[PDB]
Design a protein around this ligand. Sequence first.
Ligand code: MG
Ligand code: MG
Ligand code: MG
Ligand code: MG
Ligand code: MG
Ligand code: MG
Ligand code: MG
Ligand code: MG
Ligand code: MG
Ligand code: MG
Ligand code: MG
Ligand code: MG
Ligand code: MG
Ligand code: MG
Ligand code: MG
Ligand code: MG
Ligand code: MG
Ligand code: MG
Ligand code: MG
Ligand code: MG
Ligand code: MG
Ligand code: MG
Ligand code: MG
Ligand code: MG
Ligand code: MG
Ligand code: MG
Ligand code: MG
Ligand code: MG
Ligand code: MG
Ligand code: MG
Ligand code: MG
Ligand code: MG
Ligand code: MG
Ligand code: MG
Ligand code: MG
Ligand code: MG
Ligand code: MG
Ligand code: MG
Ligand code: MG
Ligand code: MG
Ligand code: MG
Ligand code: MG
Ligand code: MG
Ligand code: MG
Ligand code: MG
Ligand code: MG
Ligand code: MG
Ligand code: MG
Ligand code: MG
Ligand code: MG
Ligand code: MG
Ligand code: MG
Ligand code: MG
Ligand code: MG
Ligand code: MG
Ligand code: MG
Ligand code: MG
Ligand code: MG
Ligand code: MG
Lengths: 97, 114, 155, 68
Amino acid sequence: TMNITSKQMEITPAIRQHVADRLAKLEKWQTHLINPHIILSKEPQGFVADATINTPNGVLVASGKHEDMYTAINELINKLERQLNKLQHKGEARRAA
Amino acid sequence: QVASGRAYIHASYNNTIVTITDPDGNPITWSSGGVIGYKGSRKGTPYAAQLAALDAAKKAMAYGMQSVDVIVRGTGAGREQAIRALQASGLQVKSIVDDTPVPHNGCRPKKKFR
Amino acid sequence: ARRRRAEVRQLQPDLVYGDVLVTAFINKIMRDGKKNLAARIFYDACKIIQEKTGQEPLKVFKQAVENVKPRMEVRSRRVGGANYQVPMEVSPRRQQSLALRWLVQAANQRPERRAAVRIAHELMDAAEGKGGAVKKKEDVERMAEANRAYAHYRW
Amino acid sequence: AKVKATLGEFDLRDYRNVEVLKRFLSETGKILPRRRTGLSAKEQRILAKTIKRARILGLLPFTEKLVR
RNA sequence: UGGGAGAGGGUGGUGGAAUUCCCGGAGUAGCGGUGAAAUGCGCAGAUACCGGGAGGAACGCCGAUGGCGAAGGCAGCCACCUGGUCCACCCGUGACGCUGAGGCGCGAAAGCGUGGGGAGCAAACCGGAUUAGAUACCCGGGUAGUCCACGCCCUAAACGAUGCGCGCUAGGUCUCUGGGUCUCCUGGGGGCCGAAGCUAACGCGUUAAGCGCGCCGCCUGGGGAGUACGGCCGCAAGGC
Ligand SMILES: [Mg+2]
Ligand SMILES: [Mg+2]
Ligand SMILES: [Mg+2]
Ligand SMILES: [Mg+2]
Ligand SMILES: [Mg+2]
Ligand SMILES: [Mg+2]
Ligand SMILES: [Mg+2]
Ligand SMILES: [Mg+2]
Ligand SMILES: [Mg+2]
Ligand SMILES: [Mg+2]
Ligand SMILES: [Mg+2]
Ligand SMILES: [Mg+2]
Ligand SMILES: [Mg+2]
Ligand SMILES: [Mg+2]
Ligand SMILES: [Mg+2]
Ligand SMILES: [Mg+2]
Ligand SMILES: [Mg+2]
Ligand SMILES: [Mg+2]
Ligand SMILES: [Mg+2]
Ligand SMILES: [Mg+2]
Ligand SMILES: [Mg+2]
Ligand SMILES: [Mg+2]
Ligand SMILES: [Mg+2]
Ligand SMILES: [Mg+2]
Ligand SMILES: [Mg+2]
Ligand SMILES: [Mg+2]
Ligand SMILES: [Mg+2]
Ligand SMILES: [Mg+2]
Ligand SMILES: [Mg+2]
Ligand SMILES: [Mg+2]
Ligand SMILES: [Mg+2]
Ligand SMILES: [Mg+2]
Ligand SMILES: [Mg+2]
Ligand SMILES: [Mg+2]
Ligand SMILES: [Mg+2]
Ligand SMILES: [Mg+2]
Ligand SMILES: [Mg+2]
Ligand SMILES: [Mg+2]
Ligand SMILES: [Mg+2]
Ligand SMILES: [Mg+2]
Ligand SMILES: [Mg+2]
Ligand SMILES: [Mg+2]
Ligand SMILES: [Mg+2]
Ligand SMILES: [Mg+2]
Ligand SMILES: [Mg+2]
Ligand SMILES: [Mg+2]
Ligand SMILES: [Mg+2]
Ligand SMILES: [Mg+2]
Ligand SMILES: [Mg+2]
Ligand SMILES: [Mg+2]
Ligand SMILES: [Mg+2]
Ligand SMILES: [Mg+2]
Ligand SMILES: [Mg+2]
Ligand SMILES: [Mg+2]
Ligand SMILES: [Mg+2]
Ligand SMILES: [Mg+2]
Ligand SMILES: [Mg+2]
Ligand SMILES: [Mg+2]
Ligand SMILES: [Mg+2]
């Protein structure tokens, strides 16, 4: 299933559930999300949202950063999507010749 | 029964069609990438043309055909192999001519050819 | 590897028949580096096939090998947007490896309870042209012929 | 092996001289490039033009089948 | 005055290849299509092959780094009508010149109106694929339109992103087309590399983006915006 780590931070089950609903956007692509792992962390500048997810067509590794922990998470999701969309379609590029 | 006749090779990128005629140009038999059993892009392979040319030749000889004049149309991959297979069939291949249609700049082609 | 074509290991001829091919077969039988065990199993098998059919074990073994050698195989190649099963000739080195491999594997799918016996019998069937080993070879070949049309994609 | 060499004086403008003109046609009926006819730009221009007339009179082909 | 080259323009004719369709013949189990497929077509006889016919559009090779035009642009061949342009002679006129706000004309494609025409192609549209989805790309269809006449529209990466004219400032090399005395020389075009010089650089360099003069057009931070309002033009679209 899905693991979430809050490094040197406390978070709530609510917040954990939020992340799960946010990662859920990746379900769009109808591909297997294998051991998704989210790491939440606090720098002096803001929060950091890390993630490593493996799929049948490669790994997704992304880091999101922002003063607002939710935005940091949202940017993490944005970076993950762009990667997942490349993983899922890059092979189609060279179908001809 | 016809001893001599013609062999037409219609060879495109998608398929190779071979039709053996009489000397007037009327078909006695024919074969293709479909007849020898292939579907899809496989019909455009050289081997396909080979089986096709053979099956067409075999059928033709069964009507007594011995010599043929080979008329070739198209730039398909299975072209030369069809010509090959006709020679190596047991027919005389009295001649070989390419009669591929080419316009002197007629009709606007489909989008994919521009 | 990338730089050069690697060197085929020259094996040491076996003690009982003086045969590099036998040695190779032994190693393929050999699990966990227990070659003494491996050696016995084959030689025990060599005893058995003599009892069941009085001939030269060596002759049987070698005949079984020549019967499991695939002369043609398919190797995939994704051309364009599809993976074509391209028909290829097998190098004699590889013919050997596949033959000895399938022999042991098919042997160890058999129902009789002792290895030496399975190894014995499979070598007997493969010599006569029966058994799962030869079935593998026949199949691999049929796949290749089945895709003769793609034989121009050969590298 | 340039065609212009194989002939002496001829009329570049004579559309009836099938015998000379047919030299300047490939075996497939096409008009030959300068690199085969050895003609200058100016002479090739006249050659092409009178070849086309000869075709319209019926004396030269527009195209020919290629025998192998 | 005497010549030259050219897809310069307009009008009337006319040739062959190919596509499609229709007719006749012959023949059978598929054809077509794609990356792979499917839709589609086909035993109600398709595809492939032969003969006949109809019709529209575009002109293979020649063809080129080529030619012509002010620009847009111009390509089978014949004829008629007609423009620009170059050369040699150095014969005539005697500054008759340059530019050019307004004006006028021309102005690719798409589009519009009236009428014809319609083979191929193809916006819109319908279907098949592809894809997570695919109002696309690919595939099978498909109407305007694409073509002709006349009348409109007046835009563009309408580009050399480079206004026109004149004079001046190394050469090398390829090419088109004239005139020599024909080695080569000299005109007029079209390219390339480069003297000096220019340039922020890239680059330009006797086809200047160098050095000068004349006249015109134009710019004055990005967005808002080629928008609004007014006016003028247009059938509308929409243009200035
Ligand atoms: Mg577990
Ligand atoms: Mg967890
Ligand atoms: Mg803790
Ligand atoms: Mg916590
Ligand atoms: Mg990190
Ligand atoms: Mg998003
Ligand atoms: Mg990307
Ligand atoms: Mg096909
Ligand atoms: Mg094994
Ligand atoms: Mg096996
Ligand atoms: Mg058998
Ligand atoms: Mg004359
Ligand atoms: Mg004059
Ligand atoms: Mg019919
Ligand atoms: Mg016909
Ligand atoms: Mg050309
Ligand atoms: Mg040019
Ligand atoms: Mg010019
Ligand atoms: Mg004078
Ligand atoms: Mg005077
Ligand atoms: Mg004005
Ligand atoms: Mg216009
Ligand atoms: Mg128009
Ligand atoms: Mg229109
Ligand atoms: Mg209308
Ligand atoms: Mg109209
Ligand atoms: Mg109306
Ligand atoms: Mg109409
Ligand atoms: Mg129509
Ligand atoms: Mg659709
Ligand atoms: Mg769909
Ligand atoms: Mg949907
Ligand atoms: Mg569609
Ligand atoms: Mg379409
Ligand atoms: Mg269509
Ligand atoms: Mg409409
Ligand atoms: Mg209308
Ligand atoms: Mg309309
Ligand atoms: Mg008009
Ligand atoms: Mg204007
Ligand atoms: Mg241009
Ligand atoms: Mg200009
Ligand atoms: Mg401009
Ligand atoms: Mg001006
Ligand atoms: Mg001269
Ligand atoms: Mg000259
Ligand atoms: Mg010059
Ligand atoms: Mg330069
Ligand atoms: Mg300098
Ligand atoms: Mg300056
Ligand atoms: Mg000078
Ligand atoms: Mg110069
Ligand atoms: Mg100039
Ligand atoms: Mg400048
Ligand atoms: Mg501004
Ligand atoms: Mg406006
Ligand atoms: Mg506008
Ligand atoms: Mg207004
Ligand atoms: Mg303007």
